[PDB]
Scaffold this motif. Sequence first.
Motif, PDB file in Angstrom:
ATOM      1  N   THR A 112      -6.358  -0.627  -3.956  1.00 43.53           N
ATOM      2  CA  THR A 112      -6.095   0.132  -2.734  1.00 43.53           C
ATOM      3  C   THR A 112      -5.737  -0.792  -1.565  1.00 43.53           C
ATOM      4  OG1 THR A 112      -8.449   0.173  -2.105  1.00 43.53           O
ATOM      5  CG2 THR A 112      -7.628   2.011  -3.429  1.00 43.53           C
ATOM      6  N   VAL A 113      -5.132  -0.222  -0.527  1.00 43.96           N
ATOM      7  CA  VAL A 113      -4.859  -0.952   0.706  1.00 43.96           C
ATOM      8  C   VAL A 113      -4.798   0.059   1.857  1.00 43.96           C
ATOM      9  CG1 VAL A 113      -2.342  -0.873   0.500  1.00 43.96           C
ATOM     10  CG2 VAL A 113      -3.414  -2.745   1.761  1.00 43.96           C
ATOM     11  N   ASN A 114      -5.256  -0.339   3.039  1.00 48.85           N
ATOM     12  CA  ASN A 114      -5.172   0.528   4.213  1.00 48.85           C
ATOM     13  C   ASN A 114      -4.020   0.097   5.134  1.00 48.85           C
ATOM     14  OD1 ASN A 114      -5.499   1.749   6.760  1.00 48.85           O
ATOM     15  ND2 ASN A 114      -7.737   1.772   6.628  1.00 48.85           N
ATOM     16  N   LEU A 115      -3.146   1.037   5.487  1.00 47.16           N
ATOM     17  CA  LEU A 115      -2.014   0.736   6.366  1.00 47.16           C
ATOM     18  C   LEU A 115      -2.418   0.636   7.842  1.00 47.16           C
ATOM     19  CD1 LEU A 115       0.715   3.073   4.794  1.00 47.16           C
ATOM     20  CD2 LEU A 115       0.433   0.611   4.463  1.00 47.16           C
ATOM     21  N   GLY A 116      -3.614   1.116   8.169  1.00 43.45           N
ATOM     22  CA  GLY A 116      -4.166   0.968   9.507  1.00 43.45           C
ATOM     23  C   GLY A 116      -3.730   1.965  10.569  1.00 43.45           C
ATOM     24  N   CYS A 117      -2.785   2.841  10.243  1.00 45.15           N
ATOM     25  CA  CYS A 117      -2.335   3.849  11.204  1.00 45.15           C
ATOM     26  C   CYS A 117      -2.042   5.193  10.538  1.00 45.15           C
ATOM     27  CB  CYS A 117      -1.091   3.359  11.950  1.00 45.15           C
ATOM     28  SG  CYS A 117       0.322   2.974  10.892  1.00 45.15           S
ATOM     29  N   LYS A 118      -1.961   6.247  11.345  1.00 43.92           N
ATOM     30  CA  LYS A 118      -1.620   7.571  10.840  1.00 43.92           C
ATOM     31  C   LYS A 118      -0.109   7.708  10.675  1.00 43.92           C
ATOM     32  CE  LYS A 118      -5.950   8.969  11.197  1.00 43.92           C
ATOM     33  NZ  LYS A 118      -6.794   9.366  10.038  1.00 43.92           N
ATOM     34  N   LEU A 119       0.314   8.503   9.696  1.00 45.27           N
ATOM     35  CA  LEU A 119       1.736   8.659   9.399  1.00 45.27           C
ATOM     36  C   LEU A 119       2.103  10.119   9.165  1.00 45.27           C
ATOM     37  CD1 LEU A 119       2.381   5.617   7.013  1.00 45.27           C
ATOM     38  CD2 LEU A 119       2.830   5.793   9.469  1.00 45.27           C
ATOM     39  N   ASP A 120       3.404  10.386   9.101  1.00 46.65           N
ATOM     40  CA  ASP A 120       3.901  11.739   8.888  1.00 46.65           C
ATOM     41  C   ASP A 120       4.614  11.831   7.545  1.00 46.65           C
ATOM     42  OD1 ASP A 120       4.524  14.401   9.290  1.00 46.65           O
ATOM     43  OD2 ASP A 120       6.346  13.953  10.433  1.00 46.65           O
ATOM     44  N   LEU A 121       3.852  12.212   6.527  1.00 44.94           N
ATOM     45  CA  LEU A 121       4.303  12.193   5.141  1.00 44.94           C
ATOM     46  C   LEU A 121       5.570  13.013   4.881  1.00 44.94           C
ATOM     47  CD1 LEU A 121       1.402  11.015   5.006  1.00 44.94           C
ATOM     48  CD2 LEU A 121       1.052  12.362   2.924  1.00 44.94           C
TER      49      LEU A 121
ATOM     50  N   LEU B  47       0.011   6.005  -3.854  1.00 39.16           N
ATOM     51  CA  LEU B  47      -0.510   7.222  -3.223  1.00 39.16           C
ATOM     52  C   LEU B  47      -0.802   7.010  -1.735  1.00 39.16           C
ATOM     53  CD1 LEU B  47      -3.225   8.378  -5.844  1.00 39.16           C
ATOM     54  CD2 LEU B  47      -0.786   8.909  -5.876  1.00 39.16           C
ATOM     55  N   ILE B  48      -0.008   7.613  -0.854  1.00 40.27           N
ATOM     56  CA  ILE B  48      -0.152   7.359   0.579  1.00 40.27           C
ATOM     57  C   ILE B  48      -0.755   8.561   1.305  1.00 40.27           C
ATOM     58  CG2 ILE B  48       1.036   6.887   2.753  1.00 40.27           C
ATOM     59  CD1 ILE B  48       3.280   5.588   0.949  1.00 40.27           C
ATOM     60  N   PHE B  49      -1.904   8.343   1.937  1.00 34.48           N
ATOM     61  CA  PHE B  49      -2.639   9.399   2.630  1.00 34.48           C
ATOM     62  C   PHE B  49      -2.211   9.500   4.090  1.00 34.48           C
ATOM     63  CE2 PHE B  49      -6.174   8.300  -0.496  1.00 34.48           C
ATOM     64  CZ  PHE B  49      -5.865   9.343  -1.339  1.00 34.48           C
ATOM     65  N   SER B  50      -2.428  10.669   4.684  1.00 37.68           N
ATOM     66  CA  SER B  50      -2.168  10.868   6.104  1.00 37.68           C
ATOM     67  C   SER B  50      -3.168  10.078   6.944  1.00 37.68           C
ATOM     68  CB  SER B  50      -2.228  12.353   6.463  1.00 37.68           C
ATOM     69  OG  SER B  50      -1.390  13.115   5.611  1.00 37.68           O
ATOM     70  N   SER B  51      -4.315   9.767   6.347  1.00 39.71           N
ATOM     71  CA  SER B  51      -5.379   9.030   7.024  1.00 39.71           C
ATOM     72  C   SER B  51      -4.977   7.597   7.354  1.00 39.71           C
ATOM     73  CB  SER B  51      -6.645   9.019   6.167  1.00 39.71           C
ATOM     74  OG  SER B  51      -6.415   8.356   4.938  1.00 39.71           O
ATOM     75  N   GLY B  52      -4.088   7.029   6.546  1.00 37.48           N
ATOM     76  CA  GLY B  52      -3.657   5.653   6.726  1.00 37.48           C
ATOM     77  C   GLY B  52      -3.999   4.755   5.553  1.00 37.48           C
ATOM     78  N   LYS B  53      -4.731   5.312   4.599  1.00 36.21           N
ATOM     79  CA  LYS B  53      -5.042   4.636   3.346  1.00 36.21           C
ATOM     80  C   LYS B  53      -3.924   4.834   2.331  1.00 36.21           C
ATOM     81  CE  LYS B  53      -9.971   5.319   4.107  1.00 36.21           C
ATOM     82  NZ  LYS B  53     -11.187   5.929   3.503  1.00 36.21           N
ATOM     83  N   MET B  54      -3.686   3.812   1.519  1.00 33.42           N
ATOM     84  CA  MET B  54      -2.818   3.968   0.363  1.00 33.42           C
ATOM     85  C   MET B  54      -3.462   3.347  -0.875  1.00 33.42           C
ATOM     86  SD  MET B  54       1.119   2.517  -0.083  1.00 33.42           S
ATOM     87  CE  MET B  54       0.614   1.040   0.793  1.00 33.42           C
ATOM     88  N   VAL B  55      -3.079   3.867  -2.036  1.00 32.20           N
ATOM     89  CA  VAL B  55      -3.514   3.357  -3.329  1.00 32.20           C
ATOM     90  C   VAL B  55      -2.342   2.944  -4.215  1.00 32.20           C
ATOM     91  CG1 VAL B  55      -4.966   3.820  -5.332  1.00 32.20           C
ATOM     92  CG2 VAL B  55      -5.448   4.967  -3.166  1.00 32.20           C
ATOM     93  N   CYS B  56      -2.428   1.762  -4.820  1.00 23.90           N
ATOM     94  CA  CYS B  56      -1.354   1.271  -5.680  1.00 23.90           C
ATOM     95  C   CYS B  56      -1.840   1.021  -7.107  1.00 23.90           C
ATOM     96  CB  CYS B  56      -0.751  -0.011  -5.105  1.00 23.90           C
ATOM     97  SG  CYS B  56       0.690  -0.629  -6.005  1.00 23.90           S
ATOM     98  N   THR B  57      -1.112   1.587  -8.066  1.00 26.64           N
ATOM     99  CA  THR B  57      -1.439   1.488  -9.490  1.00 26.64           C
ATOM    100  C   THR B  57      -0.229   1.109 -10.345  1.00 26.64           C
ATOM    101  OG1 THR B  57      -1.066   3.871  -9.857  1.00 26.64           O
ATOM    102  CG2 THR B  57      -3.322   3.166  -9.341  1.00 26.64           C
TER     103      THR B  57
ATOM    104  N   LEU C 138      -3.534  -4.347   5.662  1.00 22.03           N
ATOM    105  CA  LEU C 138      -4.957  -4.527   5.928  1.00 22.03           C
ATOM    106  C   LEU C 138      -5.805  -4.011   4.766  1.00 22.03           C
ATOM    107  CD1 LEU C 138      -4.959  -3.266   9.650  1.00 22.03           C
ATOM    108  CD2 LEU C 138      -4.347  -5.526   8.773  1.00 22.03           C
ATOM    109  N   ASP C 139      -6.954  -4.648   4.553  1.00 26.75           N
ATOM    110  CA  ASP C 139      -7.946  -4.211   3.564  1.00 26.75           C
ATOM    111  C   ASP C 139      -7.400  -4.038   2.139  1.00 26.75           C
ATOM    112  OD1 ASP C 139     -10.864  -3.437   3.569  1.00 26.75           O
ATOM    113  OD2 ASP C 139     -10.049  -1.623   2.637  1.00 26.75           O
ATOM    114  N   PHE C 140      -6.629  -5.012   1.663  1.00 31.55           N
ATOM    115  CA  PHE C 140      -6.163  -4.982   0.279  1.00 31.55           C
ATOM    116  C   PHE C 140      -7.298  -5.384  -0.658  1.00 31.55           C
ATOM    117  CE2 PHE C 140      -4.577  -7.239  -3.442  1.00 31.55           C
ATOM    118  CZ  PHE C 140      -3.735  -6.300  -4.005  1.00 31.55           C
TER     119      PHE C 140
END
Length: 167
Positions: free
Chosen positions: A1-10, A42-52, A81-83
Amino acid sequence: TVNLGCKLDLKTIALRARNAEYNPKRFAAVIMRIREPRTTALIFSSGKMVCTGAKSEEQSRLAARKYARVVQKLGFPAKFLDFKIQNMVGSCDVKFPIRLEGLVLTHQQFSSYEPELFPGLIYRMIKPRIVLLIFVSGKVVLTGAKVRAEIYEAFENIYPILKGFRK
DNA sequence: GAAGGGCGCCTATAAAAGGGGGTGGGGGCGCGAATTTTTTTTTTCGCGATCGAACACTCGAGCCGAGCAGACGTG
Protein backbone atom coordinates in the motif's frame (compact mmCIF):
# COMPACT_ATOMS: atom_id res chain seq x y z
CA THR A 1 0.00 0.00 0.00
CA VAL A 2 0.92 3.69 -0.28
CA ASN A 3 -0.80 6.93 0.80
CA LEU A 4 -1.00 9.79 -1.74
CA GLY A 5 -1.53 12.28 1.11
CA CYS A 6 -4.43 14.23 -0.43
CA LYS A 7 -8.08 13.87 -1.44
CA LEU A 8 -8.91 13.26 -5.11
CA ASP A 9 -11.85 13.15 -7.52
CA LEU A 10 -12.04 9.60 -8.86
CA LYS A 11 -14.70 10.39 -11.49
CA THR A 12 -12.36 13.00 -13.05
CA ILE A 13 -9.54 10.44 -12.81
CA ALA A 14 -11.78 7.86 -14.52
CA LEU A 15 -12.61 10.47 -17.17
CA ARG A 16 -8.96 11.45 -17.74
CA ALA A 17 -7.20 8.06 -17.43
CA ARG A 18 -6.86 5.65 -20.35
CA ASN A 19 -6.11 2.43 -18.48
CA ALA A 20 -8.67 2.61 -15.67
CA GLU A 21 -12.31 1.98 -14.70
CA TYR A 22 -14.72 3.36 -12.11
CA ASN A 23 -18.10 2.20 -10.79
CA PRO A 24 -19.62 3.74 -7.61
CA LYS A 25 -22.50 1.27 -7.86
CA ARG A 26 -19.99 -1.59 -7.69
CA PHE A 27 -17.07 -0.41 -5.55
CA ALA A 28 -15.73 2.82 -4.08
CA ALA A 29 -12.16 2.74 -5.41
CA VAL A 30 -10.97 3.42 -8.96
CA ILE A 31 -9.14 0.54 -10.67
CA MET A 32 -5.92 1.14 -12.62
CA ARG A 33 -3.56 -1.28 -14.43
CA ILE A 34 -0.20 -0.63 -16.11
CA ARG A 35 1.94 -2.84 -18.38
CA GLU A 36 5.07 -1.95 -16.41
CA PRO A 37 5.87 -5.07 -14.33
CA ARG A 38 2.20 -5.65 -15.15
CA THR A 39 0.28 -4.59 -12.03
CA THR A 40 -3.02 -3.20 -10.73
CA ALA A 41 -3.86 -0.40 -8.26
CA LEU A 42 -6.77 0.56 -5.96
CA ILE A 43 -7.13 4.32 -5.38
CA PHE A 44 -9.42 5.58 -2.60
CA SER A 45 -11.09 8.98 -2.29
CA SER A 46 -9.47 9.16 1.16
CA GLY A 47 -6.00 9.48 -0.37
CA LYS A 48 -4.83 5.91 0.20
CA MET A 49 -3.87 3.62 -2.64
CA VAL A 50 -3.05 -0.09 -2.84
CA CYS A 51 -0.72 -1.72 -5.38
CA THR A 52 -0.69 -5.44 -6.26
CA GLY A 53 0.80 -7.78 -8.85
CA ALA A 54 4.48 -6.84 -8.87
CA LYS A 55 6.98 -9.71 -8.78
CA SER A 56 9.48 -7.75 -6.69
CA GLU A 57 9.46 -5.05 -3.99
CA GLU A 58 11.56 -2.65 -6.06
CA GLN A 59 9.19 -2.96 -9.02
CA SER A 60 6.19 -2.44 -6.70
CA ARG A 61 7.87 0.68 -5.34
CA LEU A 62 8.54 1.46 -8.99
CA ALA A 63 4.91 0.91 -10.02
CA ALA A 64 3.52 2.98 -7.11
CA ARG A 65 5.84 5.83 -8.09
CA LYS A 66 4.57 5.51 -11.67
CA TYR A 67 0.98 5.74 -10.35
CA ALA A 68 1.92 8.79 -8.29
CA ARG A 69 3.38 10.13 -11.55
CA VAL A 70 0.17 9.84 -13.64
CA VAL A 71 -1.81 11.40 -10.75
CA GLN A 72 0.62 14.35 -10.81
CA LYS A 73 0.21 14.46 -14.60
CA LEU A 74 -3.56 14.80 -14.05
CA GLY A 75 -2.81 18.01 -12.17
CA PHE A 76 -3.25 16.60 -8.68
CA PRO A 77 -0.78 17.22 -5.81
CA ALA A 78 0.37 13.58 -5.51
CA LYS A 79 2.88 12.61 -2.81
CA PHE A 80 4.86 9.40 -2.37
CA LEU A 81 4.14 8.90 1.33
CA ASP A 82 3.83 5.85 3.62
CA PHE A 83 4.90 3.16 1.13
CA LYS A 84 4.90 -0.31 2.70
CA ILE A 85 4.82 -3.94 1.58
CA GLN A 86 1.82 -5.67 3.15
CA ASN A 87 2.05 -9.20 1.77
CA MET A 88 4.23 -11.47 -0.36
CA VAL A 89 3.30 -14.68 -2.19
CA GLY A 90 5.68 -17.39 -3.38
CA SER A 91 5.71 -20.89 -4.82
CA CYS A 92 7.93 -23.81 -5.87
CA ASP A 93 7.81 -27.51 -6.73
CA VAL A 94 9.60 -30.59 -5.38
CA LYS A 95 8.94 -32.96 -8.34
CA PHE A 96 7.60 -35.98 -6.37
CA PRO A 97 4.24 -37.24 -5.01
CA ILE A 98 3.68 -36.98 -1.25
CA ARG A 99 1.87 -38.47 1.75
CA LEU A 100 -0.80 -36.03 2.97
CA GLU A 101 -2.85 -38.27 5.30
CA GLY A 102 0.36 -38.87 7.26
CA LEU A 103 1.39 -35.20 7.30
CA VAL A 104 -2.02 -34.25 8.72
CA LEU A 105 -1.76 -37.15 11.17
CA THR A 106 1.68 -36.13 12.44
CA HIS A 107 0.96 -32.38 12.40
CA GLN A 108 -2.69 -32.43 13.55
CA GLN A 109 -2.19 -29.23 15.56
CA PHE A 110 -1.38 -27.14 12.47
CA SER A 111 -2.73 -28.90 9.40
CA SER A 112 -6.36 -28.67 8.30
CA TYR A 113 -6.59 -30.92 5.24
CA GLU A 114 -10.03 -30.86 3.68
CA PRO A 115 -9.94 -33.08 0.57
CA GLU A 116 -13.65 -32.60 0.13
CA LEU A 117 -13.53 -28.82 -0.13
CA PHE A 118 -10.20 -27.39 -1.31
CA PRO A 119 -7.98 -30.02 -2.99
CA GLY A 120 -4.80 -29.15 -1.15
CA LEU A 121 -3.61 -29.24 2.44
CA ILE A 122 -3.61 -25.98 4.37
CA TYR A 123 -0.56 -25.63 6.65
CA ARG A 124 -0.34 -22.78 9.14
CA MET A 125 3.29 -22.14 10.15
CA ILE A 126 3.87 -20.07 13.30
CA LYS A 127 7.56 -19.25 12.83
CA PRO A 128 7.48 -16.38 10.31
CA ARG A 129 3.76 -17.01 10.67
CA ILE A 130 3.09 -18.15 7.13
CA VAL A 131 0.19 -19.93 5.43
CA LEU A 132 1.05 -22.75 3.04
CA LEU A 133 -0.89 -24.66 0.41
CA ILE A 134 0.51 -28.08 -0.41
CA PHE A 135 -0.80 -30.22 -3.27
CA VAL A 136 -0.44 -33.95 -3.94
CA SER A 137 1.66 -33.30 -7.08
CA GLY A 138 4.28 -31.68 -4.86
CA LYS A 139 3.61 -28.05 -5.71
CA VAL A 140 3.67 -25.59 -2.81
CA VAL A 141 2.31 -22.07 -2.42
CA LEU A 142 3.07 -19.68 0.45
CA THR A 143 1.48 -16.45 1.71
CA GLY A 144 1.36 -14.14 4.73
CA ALA A 145 4.99 -13.12 4.28
CA LYS A 146 6.38 -9.61 4.73
CA VAL A 147 9.91 -10.43 3.52
CA ARG A 148 11.48 -13.03 1.21
CA ALA A 149 13.53 -14.55 4.04
CA GLU A 150 10.34 -15.71 5.76
CA ILE A 151 9.49 -17.75 2.64
CA TYR A 152 12.92 -19.39 2.45
CA GLU A 153 12.85 -20.00 6.21
CA ALA A 154 9.28 -21.39 6.21
CA PHE A 155 10.26 -23.59 3.24
CA GLU A 156 13.57 -24.53 4.85
CA ASN A 157 11.54 -25.84 7.79
CA ILE A 158 9.00 -27.76 5.68
CA TYR A 159 11.18 -29.25 2.89
CA PRO A 160 12.81 -32.05 4.89
CA ILE A 161 9.43 -33.17 6.27
CA LEU A 162 7.93 -33.22 2.76
CA LYS A 163 10.84 -35.19 1.22
CA GLY A 164 10.35 -37.55 4.18
CA PHE A 165 6.85 -38.42 2.97
CA ARG A 166 7.93 -38.97 -0.64
CA LYS A 167 6.17 -41.72 -2.57
C1' DG B 1 -32.41 -33.69 -30.50
C1' DA B 2 -30.01 -36.38 -26.67
C1' DA B 3 -25.52 -37.69 -25.10
C1' DG B 4 -20.94 -36.03 -24.62
C1' DG B 5 -16.52 -33.39 -24.99
C1' DG B 6 -14.70 -28.89 -24.21
C1' DC B 7 -14.26 -24.38 -22.08
C1' DG B 8 -14.08 -21.59 -18.19
C1' DC B 9 -15.64 -20.24 -13.61
C1' DC B 10 -15.81 -21.97 -8.57
C1' DT B 11 -13.78 -22.48 -3.89
C1' DA B 12 -9.36 -21.36 -0.90
C1' DT B 13 -5.52 -18.06 1.43
C1' DA B 14 -3.66 -13.32 2.40
C1' DA B 15 -4.18 -8.58 3.14
C1' DA B 16 -5.39 -3.93 3.48
C1' DA B 17 -8.69 -0.18 2.91
C1' DG B 18 -13.84 2.40 2.52
C1' DG B 19 -18.40 1.86 3.17
C1' DG B 20 -22.85 -0.60 3.17
C1' DG B 21 -25.16 -4.29 5.53
C1' DG B 22 -26.69 -8.10 9.37
C1' DT B 23 -27.19 -9.73 14.36
C1' DG B 24 -27.83 -8.89 18.94
C1' DG B 25 -27.84 -6.19 22.97
C1' DG B 26 -31.04 -3.41 25.02
C1' DG B 27 -34.96 -0.91 25.23
C1' DG B 28 -39.90 0.01 24.88
C1' DC B 29 -44.67 0.81 23.02
C1' DG B 30 -48.55 -1.70 21.55
C1' DC B 31 -52.71 -4.04 20.98
C1' DG B 32 -53.59 -6.97 18.66
C1' DA B 33 -51.07 -11.77 18.65
C1' DA B 34 -56.17 -12.88 19.96
C1' DT B 35 -56.13 -18.78 22.18
C1' DT B 36 -61.11 -18.09 22.41
C1' DT B 37 -62.06 -22.56 24.19
C1' DT B 38 -67.28 -24.79 25.05
C1' DT B 39 -66.37 -26.53 28.13
C1' DT B 40 -65.49 -30.10 31.79
C1' DT B 41 -68.83 -31.43 34.63
C1' DT B 42 -68.57 -33.13 39.26
C1' DT B 43 -73.55 -32.78 41.20
C1' DT B 44 -74.95 -35.01 44.80
C1' DC B 45 -74.89 -30.88 46.94
C1' DG B 46 -76.29 -28.03 51.14
C1' DC B 47 -75.85 -25.11 54.08
C1' DG B 48 -74.66 -20.47 54.91
C1' DA B 49 -73.16 -17.18 53.38
C1' DT B 50 -73.87 -12.33 50.70
C1' DC B 51 -77.01 -9.29 48.21
C1' DG B 52 -80.60 -6.06 46.05
C1' DA B 53 -85.31 -5.70 45.01
C1' DA B 54 -89.72 -5.52 47.30
C1' DC B 55 -92.51 -3.48 50.72
C1' DA B 56 -94.74 -1.75 55.21
C1' DC B 57 -94.92 1.35 59.30
C1' DT B 58 -93.74 5.81 61.56
C1' DC B 59 -92.58 10.76 61.64
C1' DG B 60 -92.45 15.56 60.06
C1' DA B 61 -94.46 19.47 57.73
C1' DG B 62 -98.33 21.65 55.57
C1' DC B 63 -103.30 22.16 54.90
C1' DC B 64 -108.26 22.20 56.24
C1' DG B 65 -111.92 22.26 59.90
C1' DA B 66 -113.37 23.80 64.31
C1' DG B 67 -112.61 27.04 67.90
C1' DC B 68 -111.68 31.76 68.96
C1' DA B 69 -110.55 36.79 68.15
C1' DG B 70 -111.46 41.02 65.44
C1' DA B 71 -114.39 43.81 62.45
C1' DC B 72 -119.03 45.23 60.43
C1' DG B 73 -124.10 46.19 60.87
C1' DT B 74 -128.72 46.72 63.21
C1' DG B 75 -131.54 47.40 67.42
